[PDB]
């Protein structure tokens, strides 16, 4: 009958890059989901396969709180059946996704005047990600028939680029913190309720 550590994910001081997203595993606790959604602090709080208000009266075997940072333009892609550089090469939601996507603008916390290049995304990859695939390989992307052997140049580029977050960027070019709550099923016993 312990309360869930949702505060530890949502209110975490530093978040992750989107290609290297986190999976805090939630287990054995009570979650007041209605405390989270009435927060009215989110520019995006869009579930799928379940209702936000009916969520309090429910249970699951495991809740997975995935959290990362992207731009506001790409928030649309944190959804089932999306394309784009984030949806394809960084974080992919299944077409049978049954959780919630939550996002809020982070330009105050996550942007430095000289430019904050701490956050990153994956720009080059030979094929799309499987659902919930995390790819942290920094291997020089090969574009030609000629292999790279860890030496940049023509047809041989670093697979990762950097977000350029400045407080004067456009609102879409601004950083948005995303938290993705994935819900499983029963058959196996449940540990998270409300």
């Amino acid at each position, epitope marked *: 009958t312990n309360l869930c550590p949702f505060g530890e994910v949502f*209110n975490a001081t530093r978040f992750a890059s989107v290609y290297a997203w986190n*999976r805090k595993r939630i287990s054995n606790c009570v979650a007041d989901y209605s405390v989270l959604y009435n927060s009215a602090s989110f520019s995006t709080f869009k579930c799928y396969g379940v209702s936000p208000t009916k969520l309090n009266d429910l249970c699951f075997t495991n809740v997975y709180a995935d959290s990362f940072v992207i731009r506001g333009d790409e928030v649309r892609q944190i959804a089932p059946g999306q394309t784009g550089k984030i949806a394809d090469y960084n974080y992919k939601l299944p077409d049978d996704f049954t959780g919630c996507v939550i996002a809020w603008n982070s330009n105050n916390l996550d942007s430095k005047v000289g430019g904050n290049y701490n956050y990153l995304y994956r720009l080059f990859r030979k094929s799309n990600l499987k659902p919930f695939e995390r790819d942290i390989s920094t291997e020089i992307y090969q574009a030609g028939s000629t292999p790279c052997n860890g030496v940049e140049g023509f047809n041989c580029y670093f697979p990762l680029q950097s977000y350029g977050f400045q407080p004067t960027n456009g609102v879409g070019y601004q950083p948005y913190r995303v938290v993705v709550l994935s819900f499983e099923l029963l058959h196996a016993p449940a540990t998270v309720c409300g």
Partner: antibody
Amino acid sequence: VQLVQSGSELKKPGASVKVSCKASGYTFTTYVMNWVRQAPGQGLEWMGWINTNTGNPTYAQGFTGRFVFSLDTSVSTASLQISSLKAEDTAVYYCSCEITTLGGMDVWGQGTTVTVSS
Amino acid sequence: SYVLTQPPSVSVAPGKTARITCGGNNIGSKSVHWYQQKPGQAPVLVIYYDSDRPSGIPERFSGSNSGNTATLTISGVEAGDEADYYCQVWDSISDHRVFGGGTKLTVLG
């Protein structure tokens, strides 16, 4: 990605020492630098971090007063300076980089051993 | 600051499952990470995020974290798995990370 540290140091009590940590392979200022201490027969003990961007250092309770995290972005090198060495400062010191608190402490130097004996 | 409690030594037979516990005040609420330091070498990350495996670690390594103890479980214990094992947590608000006391795994081989 590579982290290479300075060689073994020997000092009398009350002396000073500065351990360097040259990096290579990535952008030095992108990722936080972290320092960890391991005394003989003990375990790893987190010392703190210096933000390689703003320069702001964080010292956990127990390493305040005599330690100085500094940087030299020109050579992609962080440095650890200790003032007024004590016998209990004798340990192996590691520089390690957090990508994030994800792969946190995911690249480590080979270690610099520091012995303080009178 | 925060406190982490490891068993100092654990004895397991070759091939069997070794279990190392990591105690802490409500540690299933945070993310635990496990390291493996052979004598004379730098620490190496074997499990981050309670259970997630880095690329290159054998499938034998799997983690756990709930309640107040994380649990590092090594599946097929091999002769080369003798080393010290530390558990580390990072505090979200404090931004401090805290290490444990260590655990010397000995193979009864």
